[PDB]
Amino acid sequence: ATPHINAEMGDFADVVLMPGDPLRAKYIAETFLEDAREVNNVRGMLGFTGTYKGRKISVMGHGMGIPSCSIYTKELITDFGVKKIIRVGSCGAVLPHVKLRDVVIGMGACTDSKVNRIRFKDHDFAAIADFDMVRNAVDAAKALGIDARVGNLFSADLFYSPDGEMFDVMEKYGILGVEMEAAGIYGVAAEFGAKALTICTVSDHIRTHEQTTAAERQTTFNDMIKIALESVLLGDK
Amino acid sequence: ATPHINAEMGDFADVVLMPGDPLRAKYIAETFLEDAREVNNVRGMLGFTGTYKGRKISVMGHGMGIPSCSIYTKELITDFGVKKIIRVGSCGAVLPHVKLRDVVIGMGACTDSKVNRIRFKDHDFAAIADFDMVRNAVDAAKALGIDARVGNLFSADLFYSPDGEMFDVMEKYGILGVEMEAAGIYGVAAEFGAKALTICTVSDHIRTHEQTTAAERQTTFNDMIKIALESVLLGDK
Amino acid sequence: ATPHINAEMGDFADVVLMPGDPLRAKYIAETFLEDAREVNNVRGMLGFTGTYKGRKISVMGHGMGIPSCSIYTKELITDFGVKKIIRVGSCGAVLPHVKLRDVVIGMGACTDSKVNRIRFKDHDFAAIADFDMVRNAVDAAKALGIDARVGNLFSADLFYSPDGEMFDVMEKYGILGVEMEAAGIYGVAAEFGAKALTICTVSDHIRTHEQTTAAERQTTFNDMIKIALESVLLGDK
Amino acid sequence: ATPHINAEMGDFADVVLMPGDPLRAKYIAETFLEDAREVNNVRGMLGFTGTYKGRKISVMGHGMGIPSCSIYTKELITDFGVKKIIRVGSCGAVLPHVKLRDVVIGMGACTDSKVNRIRFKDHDFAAIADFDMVRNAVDAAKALGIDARVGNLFSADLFYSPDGEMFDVMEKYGILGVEMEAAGIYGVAAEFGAKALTICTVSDHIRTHEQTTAAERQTTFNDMIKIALESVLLGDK
Amino acid sequence: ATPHINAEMGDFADVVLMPGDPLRAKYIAETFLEDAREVNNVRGMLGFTGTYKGRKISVMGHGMGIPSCSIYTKELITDFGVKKIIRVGSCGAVLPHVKLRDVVIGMGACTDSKVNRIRFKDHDFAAIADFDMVRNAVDAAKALGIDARVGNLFSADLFYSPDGEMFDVMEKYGILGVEMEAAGIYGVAAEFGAKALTICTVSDHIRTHEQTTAAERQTTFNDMIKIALESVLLGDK
Amino acid sequence: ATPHINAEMGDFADVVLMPGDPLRAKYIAETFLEDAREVNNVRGMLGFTGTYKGRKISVMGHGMGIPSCSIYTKELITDFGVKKIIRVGSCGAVLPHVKLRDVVIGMGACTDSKVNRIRFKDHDFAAIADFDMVRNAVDAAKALGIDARVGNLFSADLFYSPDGEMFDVMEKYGILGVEMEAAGIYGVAAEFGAKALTICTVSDHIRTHEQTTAAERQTTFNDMIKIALESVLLGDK
Numbered sequence A, B, C, D, E, F: 001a002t003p004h005i006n007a008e009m010g011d012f013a014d015v016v017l018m019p020g021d022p023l024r025a026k027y028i029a030e031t032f033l034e035d036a037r038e039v040n041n042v043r044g045m046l047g048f049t050g051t052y053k054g055r056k057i058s059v060m061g062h063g064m065g066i067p068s069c070s071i072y073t074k075e076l077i078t079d080f081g082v083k084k085i086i087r088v089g090s091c092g093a094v095l096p097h098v099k100l101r102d103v104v105i106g107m108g109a110c111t112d113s114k115v116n117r118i119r120f121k122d123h124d125f126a127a128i129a130d131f132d133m134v135r136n137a138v139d140a141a142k143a144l145g146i147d148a149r150v151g152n153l154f155s156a157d158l159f160y161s162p163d164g165e166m167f168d169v170m171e172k173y174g175i176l177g178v179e180m181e182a183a184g185i186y187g188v189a190a191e192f193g194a195k196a197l198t199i200c201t202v203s204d205h206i207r208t209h210e211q212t213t214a215a216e217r218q219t220t221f222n223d224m225i226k227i228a229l230e231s232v233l234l235g236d237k
């Protein structure tokens, strides 16, 4: 067991889907996994390991923000043999043509955090996802008839940012989604030798102001989870 | 209700104690509060409200990291009328003379994050606690016959930092403890006009390396909690 | 005509292959293009426009370093309707398993330059290539039976860097190739609304010290040019 | 003797009062101390030692700016056994509810200087005062009927700053006063393991020019000195 | 031979004039040098060696940008025994009183690049020319009856900068001209122990916007070249 | 009058000599000027005005550090019509071939201070002196048989810097002397359109402690003053 995960080598699959909310991980294990088994509950960060069309799969929340997910993704990679991490969460849109419920694949991740500068001697480190994983997700998406944009995300440290102007700069440079973890997960993966990918569903719109609503949430969310699970299968082949 | 808290104005007291672990919050409510009632469960971040010796008090977890605690404290202050926040957690030791089971009070907090620089035009903002709250905590500790150390804490973004040379620096400049939220909580308090304080017990010693396993460590964690509760009573006078 | 290119709207195709060396552009127009026509010679930066299997194509050098290529890629994009830029050059390897003559596709680009920080309010901008272009290049590569690694490149400002330690950091984070333009071309593309991709051939080895040699250069170089030209065709489909 | 102090060990007491202007050190010694003797005159920075109600105390000017005071506070601490330094001077205010002639105590000190970043691996160091010294001053003030405010100060490198928008940022974050030494002195104290405190009287209000007679000023200056001196006696208890 | 220069020790004189455009280099050789011979053609960066009034002199292009000129000047100094480098180019006007056809001498050079910070531990390194070379240039200009202005130049990484607010700043602090190499050439000279100087003629006015088209502008460019040639003669004495 | 100078327009000449220690301004005036009158005594920073061979000249101390001298040089320039400022002081050396008591002229000044970055949009500003003043001093030195060196100086914020490795970096880049004001004074001069120069004598050698009598020092100090004064007369020609 590690400082933040009470489990043992073997309890997790080599791939792990990770939403921010611990209750979402649970819902996922109950809606997409067979023989779901709870493997962790320290600090309430629920973790599950089951099967999907025969494939062993794990799902566990990672909390909010870079510092939080870095801890879990790190422990999973060094003490439980996890090879692939797949973040499945929500994000805020800045581009007018990017509407709600839209699915975005984070090929890269911009951030205003200092974690990567500390790792890269104060220079610019391009936090990127594993190419094959991105490719898998795009193909699984087409096979499901679900749209998907591939590009840059922005991992912010402050959900309530005092710098309003920064959103215009984001828009100008084509940021597809604003969240709070991608840049950190790519840093950890690169540092500890693993692969990662971040997939997000456009919740609210930073401009228009309007979060998720009705039953559209679940359906769109299920599409994201579906895309992630199928991408793992295309990767095993 | 706010994006991360499903409650209404009044469900929280004007004073909230915040441990990092939501399970630790339930522990506080059931151990020290009377007539406790759960007021939040969003994302599993349990929040409770009850009374201590007749005073209305609230306790709620804030997750790990500056980005996480920044959201919760911000929403409490601007949407729930909270005026005081008291973080109660654990920290890693840096100074040789700082022994285990020592109660540390963070009058100030150094940090690795750039959240405060975003706020302060890229200059040095000295993240500090509220003076009266610090004094109340020192007096409450004395009344209980407990020796409290007041000084600087260090708030890191990476629990698993890639540079160990930084620990000598923290020691050279007198940092009493290493945790992950103080600097962020103080930035929020100053940004939105509220008051905050961080109290910690030393759970490990990055120096001689010393974990913890005894009824004695659990006795000191409770002393810290009693120090926080009693200090609010002193403040009301 | 623009300040650095004496030509007119229509002289360039909507796609342009760009090596660093002006003499290479010429060699390319003479070895892979039909009806090659010189369209520019200002400052000696030779530019050509011809045909490849029917497709209109242009090839022009961009000089050495971020400041140099930013100027040309900018003018091509705003005054000659260029839609896609494809850099084809050399790079130094840092990873032991990455040997000479190897072909690398730059999905992302790290840099120690300040150009992107100036554009992104001093935060971390992840300089990335267009996903489809990367995908096209990988497929064209498999079709030619030529190996190709997809990942991060490092765009350096100083060929003769005084910071030797930085190469160990590069290696640690998996940098596949060290060159001097990618990070800038991705910045310009994002700023002016175009698409770009950088493909490099591993020349010397920053560690072992041994640049190109014999006739292996041309053959491997021709493979790179072939991959780039075929990727454009897969993109038209 | 030291580069800037022509004296030997034992000439200075373990507690030193330091005003900005050197002419004030002469006034302090003849107005509050008994049996005073001169201990330094280098560069015209007069230094005196004597007693206040039987307590051995020294007083000497530190000049203007972080660099200047860092020279003196460093030499006093490592070469003359000084344990406590108390800066007594004036400051400009930015907060409306902070009246002219108010007494401000610096529990913390923000700054636009780079000295602390150079010391703290380019991270955020929270330059704070010794807590007991802060409470001593507060209680001495109360005992003298003088009410004082405790909070942040801002140590500027440029009295005539090119940026006027920073004062807005200061007001927003509750800065009580602007001067030019606290953050520097607090850094030195932490570097060599000593204790420090900065006390200031609002002499200017960077808002609407007010007016005060020369008599009022002298009266306020004496109050500040009394506070400093009585707080030392309280700390001895 | 070096990575970018195909010549042997002796092919270059101990003094090399360097214009940005290699075609401009051929122009210099054929217009002012006697018995000129091409000594380099790698990547099309033409270099020549001949004599001026009996003195052996060399002239060679350095490309656009700090990264480009840094390579060539470095290789000349460490592998070809070159002791002096004199850049002769054009610059954009900033100050209203700085008219077209004014010869500007860069005693110092501000910059946008971070190359010198990499060199100087992230501090401020004042990139300056060699004093004797500056004086020789002023005297040579006087002898020719030409008015030379000595001061600061600004070396930019982006000819097409995304911020125009920077031009007011350059004007406020007296920058005489804007180009793209001076700061880098001075860094190299200091790093490898050589001497350098940058001379420029104003080709445009970013102020009132003024290009150039007259036999008069070509007359001033030649005056600059004669100033550089004659100044070396004064130095030999 | 100004915040730090109790005098009116016309009291200071258009040229001001400024030593570090205020006691020296008294010596300069009685030793080199005729018909001297006192013009300032605030904070003990004595100011004098008089004539040297019919030339009206003023002298006054500027204190230690960038912050202090920035105060005085700013007020003299914008409130008393001062056109030229000449700092005369001492410095430590790092270069072996730079002997003790040598005369160094600062054509440029590096620094680890942040004042200029704050002025120059966080970019590199090359803090340089007025060229004519530099040549005047050189020629005055030659005329007096005194040989002087022209080059870079380093203006430190911390006399007792925590980093000892920076001195190696300084030596490598040819820094001639270390002091604490030049870069600051040069910034102010550029900000308000005036001229400045810094002249220093090597009083220390941060290498191997040497020795010099008190008589030798006085002799060297007078040489520096003569240079400064004669250079002013030359500039008038």
Ligand SMILES: Cc1ncnc2nc[nH]c12
Residues within 6 Å of the ligand: A090, A091, A092, A156, A158, A159, A160, A178, A179, A180, A203, A204, A206
């Ligand atoms: C404004 C904002 N910032 C970061 N993550 C988010 N998810 C939704 N909205 C968000």
Ligand SMILES: Cc1ncnc2nc[nH]c12
Residues within 6 Å of the ligand: B090, B091, B092, B156, B158, B159, B160, B178, B179, B180, B204, B206
């Ligand atoms: C040992 C250690 N390192 C970094 N952050 C911590 N929080 C608690 N303990 C810690």
Ligand SMILES: Cc1ncnc2nc[nH]c12
Residues within 6 Å of the ligand: C090, C091, C092, C156, C158, C159, C160, C178, C179, C180, C203, C204, C206
């Ligand atoms: C060392 C180095 N740096 C940048 N680009 C290169 N191409 C080959 N070697 C290189």
Ligand SMILES: Cc1ncnc2nc[nH]c12
Residues within 6 Å of the ligand: D090, D091, D092, D093, D156, D159, D178, D179, D180, D204
């Ligand atoms: C009024 C004022 N403004 C700025 N810095 C100061 N230091 C002391 N007093 C000051």
Ligand SMILES: Cc1ncnc2nc[nH]c12
Residues within 6 Å of the ligand: E090, E091, E092, E156, E158, E159, E160, E178, E179, E180, E204, E206
């Ligand atoms: C107008 C302009 N802007 C930036 N760099 C330049 N070099 C020459 N002219 C220039």
Ligand SMILES: Cc1ncnc2nc[nH]c12
Residues within 6 Å of the ligand: F090, F091, F092, F093, F156, F159, F178, F179, F180, F204
């Ligand atoms: C010897 C020495 N060292 C560092 N800074 C200085 N300023 C003046 N003299 C100095």
